[PDB]
From a paper:
The conjugative transfer of plasmids between Gram-negative bacteria is mediated by type IV secretion system (T4SS) and many pathogens such as Helicobacter pylori, Bartonella and Brucella species use this strategy for the transfer of virulence factors into mammalian cells. T4SS typically comprise 12 membrane-associated proteins that fall into three categories: cytoplasmic ATPases (VirB4, VirB11 and VirD4), surface-exposed pilus components (VirB2 and VirB5) and core components associated with the inner and/or the outer membrane (VirB1, VirB3, VirB6, VirB7, VirB8, VirB9 and VirB10). Here, we conducted a fragment-based screen to identify novel chemical entities that bind to and may identify novel druggable sites on TraE and other VirB8-like proteins. Also, our data demonstrate the existence of two potential druggable sites on TraE.
Whereas docking predictions are increasingly reliable, the design of inhibitors requires high-resolution structural information and towards this goal we soaked TraE crystals with the binding fragments. The discovery of this novel binding site opens additional opportunities for the design of small molecules that inhibit the functions of VirB8-like proteins. Since both fragments bind in close proximity we reasoned that combining them may generate small molecules with higher affinity. In silico docking predicted that all these molecules bind to one or both of the 1E6 binding sites observed by X-ray crystallography. Addition of the fragments as well as of the derived small molecules that do not stabilize the protein in the DSF assay at concentrations of 50 μM has no effect on conjugation.
Residue numbers in the entry:
A (entry chain D): 94 to 230
B (entry chain A): 88 to 230
The structure:
Amino acid sequence: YGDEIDKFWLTQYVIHRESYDFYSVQVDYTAVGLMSTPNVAESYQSKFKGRNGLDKVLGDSETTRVKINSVILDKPHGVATIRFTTVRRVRSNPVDDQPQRWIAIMGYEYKSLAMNAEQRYVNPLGFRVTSYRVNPE
Amino acid sequence: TRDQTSYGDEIDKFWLTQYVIHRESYDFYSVQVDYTAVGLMSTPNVAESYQSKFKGRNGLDKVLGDSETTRVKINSVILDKPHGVATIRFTTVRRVRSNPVDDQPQRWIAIMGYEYKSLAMNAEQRYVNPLGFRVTSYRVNPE
C-alpha cells in the first residue's frame, strides 16, 4: 500500500500493543486483535487471562507510554523493524521510571475482509501482523 | 471506497499531515510522487490551484530543479472531525544547494477542509490514496 501507509499501521500497532492505559486498553485490545492473525493475537491476549489479567491486576495504578524512534521496511517480504522506547509511570510515585529501549521485529500483510462498522474506524485497509517479536538493545 | 467525513483522530491526522508534507515540501527526487499524491488527495478546485505553479516553462520543478530543497516539520494538529476541518502548524527548512547552511526555519498554519469519497480508482491510485482521502479547502498563512 506504500511505505508511509505501511509505517503508520505498524507504528500504531506497536503503540496500541506496547502501551498501557486502563481507560483505553479496551480499544487497544480490540485494535491489536483486528490487526493480528488469531494465533499472534491470542499470544498477546495471554496477558489478559483469568483475574491475574494485566488490566485487572495493574488497574489504573500505573501507565506506560511508547515513543517511536525509527521504522525500517522490507516491502516484498512484508517484514519491518521498529525501534521504540517505553516509559513506565506509577501514579503514586513522583517521577517517571527510567526509559527502556526496545526493538520490534514484525511481519505484516493486507487482507480487507468482513467490512464492519466498528472495524472501519480501526483497520480499514485490513492490516494484520503475521509475526510479532520484541527484544531489548 | 466509502463516503465519510472522518476516520477518527489518528487516521485523519495521518492523511492530513501526509498531505501537508507532500504539498509543502520540495524535493526534486520526489516531486513527481508528491505532485501525483496531492492531485489524488484533492478536489479538482484544490488541485488546479496547486498544479498551477507547475505549469509552463517556469513550472516550479523546471525552474528550481535540484538547486534546492525544503523539508517539513509538523508541530501540531487540531482536528474538528464533525466538520472535516483541521488546523496544522508546521515548520519549513529551506536549503539552497549553493549554501553551506540551511535557511532559517519558517512557521506556518494550514487551515484545511477534508473528507473521504468513494470513487473509481485504478491500481496505482488506490496504492497512494486507498481510502479516497481528499482536501476540500486549503489555505496557508505565516505564524
